[PDB]
């Protein structure tokens, strides 16, 4: 006997004693199986099976009367059952443990009205439920007594009970929502009573009676009762018969009981605890008119949708939260259709909101202060029976149809070549949108809605045309990037290609006949990878080809007896290897020379049946080294326990998950805090989004008390609004503040506030319709919540090897004397030396200026800072200007197209003036470009700085006023005499450009001062600045810079790879060389000699730093997630050993770091174990060495603050494309490597592992090819990637489960059937 | 998302009737994989656990 | 581990902290490092405090620089029974002066010092031996020594200096004893070399110690004559004998992986435990940290919720029982810190899940309350209204002739496990009677 369940025992006999010796031939043996009772008593056998031990058993049984699959038998030995309705509809499913998966019901046509005159309602309704603990009662005489307390005589049959007297439930529910459903049969005056909590429901043969009122019912119907502490709602036969408010207290030790006066027979009984309910009212096309979720105890969520006279969707409201505790006693329709949800509903009259624009009234206007009359998003259609979008308007007055930021589409495009190359109204539908930034975007679509080409152009940037060609079966045979079209046409005229050609820019696929799958996928940057299949169409081999069309490496797959994959390996290419592939495709055997091979053994030989077909045991073997890990999947492949098995010890390192309704409710970490195990409990509400994270504390009496880690607050639209760190002594809130269209504007807390601007303030761009973030402005006030001794700027921060120790003192004193530092050590504004007219020539020296400003920005901690952004043609971020000072209110403007119509000259005079000046200024020289012959004056300390007093004395006067030589020589006395000798010569030789000479004094009065302000402060000159001046049509930036570090990248001829990199003004050529599959193998700008990749995970294996200074060795699981890292030294001794225990998604949970400070004597290490607590948006904190640290995240998910007990113990500031500006923390226990966007930052080499791909913040380009093709180039990065801001795997997940349950309901109801629509667009013509 | 790993699930990537001998070779593959598969002290335990 | 008992704040501010670095020293004397009125250097400003009243006496802008320079050291001393301070100006000139006055002493040498991108650079420091002050220092070329005869007629005389270090780095071995030093060290990553400082200062007699992989940010010496050595790798303890190269033991506590950068190592000093044993204390990344010198090394890190936790510890700290007293400067304030040393205790927990298991027993006893029913008893009446699909009534009209045509099933039961039954009803307009 292997296992038992309830009254039934499972018994099996594995005949493992004898097998065939060599399996050349068959044994032809006989099996005789005997089932007998060894004693006098009877035995009851249900089903018998015989098979080999391997074969996956999915025996299924069918209901003898109703003829549907009502129970299936899994291999492991457990039975999972489906429950069916009276009309053979699948209404419920029961899992192996006995708790149901879902329940569904719908409005029955019997309970209907033939004639009725209403103005608002749902044609039909659906009700769906998912519950925490929920059992169906089969009234078995062997298990009923253990389940129910029976006081009277009753007579039963399989799933039916003709009962008398009363029966009570032994479970004693204590939760928010309780609900029960059943089917009865009422005769004569025989009456039935269902008591739940305080509420008793009395059903009679004529009418169902409740305390408030009695509702008519048929004598045989389905009864559903849903009770919360504030609600009761009774459905009979799918129609909500009653609903009443309740003032009852919280549910504690409540019992479900049935008491019958007379003979009644109840068929099915389904009892649900903590049941999450959803109702949907649908129109004549079975499309949802109004959805009502249950969010929480006495809180519902309502959304309503509108439809046109033809049947297309017009507008949809946002989710709104209506509360039943303060219902105001006007009415109570918590799940019934809300007539007064929208008053502007009838098209005929009452100011319909399509014409007028705002809705007049909600039930609880929780949106009107945010959405200002326009909560809905609506769509206006072209004059067509089909659904073609003309104008779509988002919520908000500004984002509505009447608003400025409305999306408008045109079917006809102004471009002649698009209309003449794609034949109009011949199955090629084109749509064109134009943003106010000067960009248009057109997309052309096939008959089957796959885009054939898209084109977009912007002001001053060349046009983009990318094309995709498809096959007869619809498979994408070819695509062509915009570099191909730019190289070919090289003019305004374009010829969008229509057929498959040979070209090195093209990405080509060649599927087999009848469209099986790819047989040769070829890309320019990688190579031609070819697929080899089997007779049974199993993917057997995968060969890679070099650029010289010769094979490189062959991946082989071996398959099991089941047809699933047995193992996977990679072998190097060879003629014998290719011939062996050719032979083994026929022989079905294995490749002989497998050096590394990962084996997958889902449990089927195990003697414990509950594991069989449920575990996934993995053995990963890379040459000598090995890695074993096995994880337990339950029903529906949800992980319940992850183990890391090693042969040395019988026990397994494991982390255990406790989950219901596909959401993880608790984690059992392999971590010890305060000498006790760390157990995390995640509490969700009735909507299933996370509401609390807590940790279990065990007490000696026999109880567990939960200490909260974080109490999370949400909005009505699923957005997370307030995270409340309530653990420890200091508790504080991080609030997210949103606006009218739905964007995140503020991240506010007492440590560091953030503001984001989307339409108001940008750098040079107007608000783009994409909703991209135009400006981020920070305000750090944590500077008195930390060890303040590390904050103030000293004069040693400016000194290093390159600059002298004595000059740093003078330059810092000069910096302090102008108010650059507000006596606390925090920089007050950015150091622009061309703004400061009087400064030492040592400070005003160029290289010293760069170093001094860079160190003042890095080691300084300004109170306000931020960036103002500017975006390009591919949606990427091409510029970002920082405002480290009070500049936030009044920043400058981009130099180009500056508004000198205000200068005092006419528009025709302005155009010639700007053309001449824009041709005669080299802007990167700054104010030097204002003067002639500045190249000859660079020989001297005085000559390099004289252009600023010369400019100031040109128009403004004052300043030094011919006595500025003495202020210049702060650090010397002798230099003043040389200054006085060279001053008049440099003053007199500086003559203005002929263009500005040709202008006139009433212009030059003031204009050249602000001209100098913009030409001094323009985007080159802050140390916080990212830019990309020149960009390929594929989005490869030919030069990119971060700060003062300028990388000029020249790309290879026909590929998107980098040919050469120039490091900066030095222009020293550092090399970078890729692989045959496109991955970079060496990049000396990161001081990397060689990158070794993993043949199995296709991730990084060995990183070698320059001059063999360090070495990083990585090891993984089969998923490609990192398992362990070993950092070695110059002498091949391990310096740091890091081990990660990964979650299934890729998140880390437990981390063991052992660092040896003395490599020779490793007996005395430093050992640190940390455990990360993840949330919706990111990691909330981490336990490390009996100490918990909070983590404060900004937008996009980067780690801004690390706080210990109300004290900031670490802080990092970032600039776009990921490079870190600065770091505060000095305590090494406080730091975490999650850094930018919560992505592990390899501190030794400087590379993030950005979602299983290396990334270089200095270049802003990925080191590996993009697996899912996102851009025309694989290595391109966007620049900024904000977070979803919606609770993931909570609200979204369960909403998707609600939709798929709606899908199965519609499938069984016949909604997806032949010609089942009242719309001729969906008819069968 | 599946319990059993698909060919596309791996990171290496860039049945009407079956004969007797194919069943025997598949059984040989299955038996081959079956035969192949079969405070500092805590730091020693876990460092032996993760990779050896 | 260290528990802060109390913090006492001084009554006078120190001004703004922008671009200033602290250097606090109590009165140094030949007889011993006795408790006295402390002298702090904040910025270019020297301040006098008396621990009795804890109030500032005077503040004289003596110094030229704010950053404690390696080229402009300063100290207090007592000489001739009179207390003096003495510092280095920007002209390389010693500025000796009694508490109130400023007696400019005569100088036999004026050091010139300059900074290099090659990192090896000139530094001078003020050390004491035999009751006399030595201004010793390495200029750009090599290392030489000087000492003050005093103020008045006194003049710096220079004793003989032989060495020219190939790899040059100068830290003084600092110890808590009556003399400020006993030795002077020249440090390299391959080995340190060390010279005894005597009645004539620097002698020829040198005592090379072997310490590899260590750039030796700090070197300390004990009254028990064992040589401490703070390095980025950690702390390595040496025993000084006729050969000082013998290696005692290593502890990884004061190291780079522990977060101990340049700014934190410079603070650590020594103090007696009380039982003729010495322990070293200094502020670091986690804060003030204190470790007894023993074969089994065990530091104690302050774990408390205050603001004066991270404080630059003044030299000459004291221990009395399990209590220590330290003088510290935090954010331009002076705090005397009383705190306690606690040996960590943690009762172990066992018998987590030993719970006595057993076999699983199953026996099927049918309830006598509940009876199985013989023969069926209820047959629900299915309604044709719910089972009748409406896809037959949606697209009915024929386009070709304008008539209407539709077929619906009259009985259709396929819940049979046997052969299903269907009988279909058709409507099609015709002209036949
Ligand atoms: C001395 O220091 C105090 C702060 O302790 C400061 O306010 C004052 O300006 C300084 N100068 C004098 C001469 O007091």
Author numbering:
A (entry chain A): 1443 to 2767
B (entry chain A): 2942 to 2955, 2967 to 2990, 3029 to 3042
C (entry chain A): 1 to 433
What does the paper say about this structure?
Cryo-EM images were obtained from salivary gland extracts without fractionation. The SGS1 structure is cocoon shaped, with dimensions of 210 Å × 115 Å × 86 Å. It is organized into 6 domains: two β-propeller domains, a rearrangement hotspot/tyrosine-aspartate (Rhs/YD)-repeats domain, a carbohydrate-binding module (CBM), a lectin carbohydrate-recognition domain (lectin-CRD), and a wedge domain. The C-terminal moiety, a ~230 aa-long sequence previously predicted to form a set of TM helices, is surprisingly almost fully buried within the chamber inside the cocoon shell and forms daisy-chained helices, which extend across the entire internal space to an opening at the middle of the Rhs/YD-repeats domain. These observations suggest that a major conformational change must occur in SGS1 to activate its catalytic activity during its secretion from the gland to saliva. The exterior surface of the SGS1 Rhs/YD shell is decorated by five domains: β-propeller 1 (residues 1–344), β-propeller 2 (residues 705–1216), a carbohydrate-binding module (CBM: residues 1345–1494), a lectin carbohydrate-recognition domain (lectin-CRD: residues 1575-1715), and a wedge domain (residues 2225–2304, 2326–2465).
One of the most abundant salivary proteins in Aedes aegypti mosquitoes is a high molecular weight (>300 kDa) protein called salivary gland surface protein 1 (SGS1); it is thought to have been acquired via horizontal transfer from bacterial endosymbionts. SGS1 is exclusively expressed in the salivary glands of adult female mosquitoes, which suggests that SGS1 is involved in blood-feeding and pathogen transmission. Here, we determine the native structure of SGS1 by the cryoID approach, showing that the 3364 amino-acid protein has a Tc toxin-like Rhs/YD shell, four receptor domains, and a set of C-terminal daisy-chained helices.
